[PDB]
Amino acid sequence: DAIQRVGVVGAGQMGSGIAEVSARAGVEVTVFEPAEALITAGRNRIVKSLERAVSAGKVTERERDRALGLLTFTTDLNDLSDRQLVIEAVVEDEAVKSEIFAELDRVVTDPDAVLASNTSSIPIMKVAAATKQPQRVLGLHFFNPVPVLPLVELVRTLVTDEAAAARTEEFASTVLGKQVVRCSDRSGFVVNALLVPYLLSAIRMVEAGFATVEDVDKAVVAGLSHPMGPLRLSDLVGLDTLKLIADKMFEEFKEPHYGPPPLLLRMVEAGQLGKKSGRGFYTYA
Amino acid sequence: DAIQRVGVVGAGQMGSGIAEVSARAGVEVTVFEPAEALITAGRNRIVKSLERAVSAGKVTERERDRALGLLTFTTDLNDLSDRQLVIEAVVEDEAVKSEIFAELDRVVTDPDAVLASNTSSIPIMKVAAATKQPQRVLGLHFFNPVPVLPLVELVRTLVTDEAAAARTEEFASTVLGKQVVRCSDRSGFVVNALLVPYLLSAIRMVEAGFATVEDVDKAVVAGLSHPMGPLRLSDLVGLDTLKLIADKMFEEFKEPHYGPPPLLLRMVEAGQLGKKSGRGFYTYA
């Protein structure tokens, strides 16, 4: 019934956060990547994250050691054969995700197991259709920084098994201590679908010279009590990431207000991607 | 150069808020309503407000009385003749605002005086066009609760005098302690033009059964760290106010995503206006 054996495929920012929160909650976690370079970069992310948490008095030294003791890193996909829940968080590319789900579906043989994707941009039904048992597949969508933000979106396809969804929801709630939000398999789900068009409209105001970057952000923090204004927040999301979600939402829904504005296109093309490149709507030193 | 004598036209929720914060800032304030019944309603708003604020530790016993000491209520518009700044916050109706601004213009004779509108729905140029000195008119847009939210929008028309704008900005910053955001005379200004399409998009999600009211609000609070989710917030803005602002944005810009969705229309027709009627997206006892 209950989930004690978790697998994670991918060890970027999101994959590393998902593995960290699962190990800190006391679950056995196996992290898979195809190459030794990617394993070591993933392990180093988790080690550094946990070292910061210790320096700030949020986790003890023994907690940190216990978490690391529950993490197993491997480049053999067969080490995932005994998992009850596997979460995929790799590059946002349809063909790479389909190949990984075909191979997970063969290797992970427990009929009660769940195969979940963290994707923001590929429809869940498309990765489910890569498997021989599509009823085991769903969306489980997390938010950076995964160890802090207490939310997941749980996305059922047309064929997701009801009992698979209930097991996953109970895991996210009872083990990870997160709030669970349900929705249908539609581009952007709930959170991104409200957030991205709002950020785009702010970018359009700036582009049309209707208000400055500083005044838009000021107006939102003071008037709406958000922690951060939309241009600052676009910079944190990443302008390339914002452009990709916007492109997928336009493709699905065809309404022009979902499409990326010209200023955003010009900034992505110049390499002005926000905080991660050193500049977007603001400069980062 | 410096403002010490302020007039407020109207004593509903916004006008009483504007008078309170000016009196607490140590400026002299005359509040005007035509009918004596409206006057008593206003004083009581302000005394309740100042009491609820002494209750929760916020202000020295005598401050409350210094503030009350600086407020004068009148049913004679000619008492506003000596005002340096007059702020109108009456019913959102073009023909009513026009009459008031034409009279104000005749009564206030100082050429350096400023006549300002708190309106959300009428273009500032239209109320300016009703006066003989249009260069004295601008928008000064506050946000409820006015003694808490530290923001105003300062909206220049095509003809607002530079000196009038700079004096008004200095009053808002230096005297009221508010942040000041500039923009042009366009439906929604900055804040409402970002907020309202975002709220409408949440309502469309609810209407299509894509996610529940509680799940959308949960996702925004946990996911985006907003203090309040969009349907809770709609209930607090008022669904009638939301419909009015959406109607004007649609008339100005003609893009369908600015128009009010059918669920919002039916709710307003049913008298389900949010917190103030006892029911909107949620029930209030």
Numbering used by the authors:
A (entry chain A), B (entry chain B): 3 to 287
From the publication, what sentences describe this entry?
Recent evidence shows that Mtb degrades host cell cholesterol during persistence and that the inhibition of cholesterol degradation could provide a potential route to control the growth of Mtb in macrophages. The cycle begins by introducing a double bond between C2 and C3 (α and β positions), which is followed by hydroxylation (step 2) and hydroxy dehydro­genation at C3 (step 3); the cycle is completed by the thiolytic cleavage of 3-ketoacyl-CoA to give acyl-CoA and acetyl-CoA (step 4). In contrast, FadB2 (Rv0468) and FadB3 (Rv1715) are smaller, monofunctional enzymes that encompass only a hydroxyacyl-CoA dehydrogenase (HAD) domain. In a previous study, we characterized the enzymatic properties of Mtb FadB2, demonstrating that it harbours 3-hydroxy dehydrogenase activity as well as catalysing the reverse reaction from acetoacetyl-CoA to 3-hydroxyacyl-CoA.
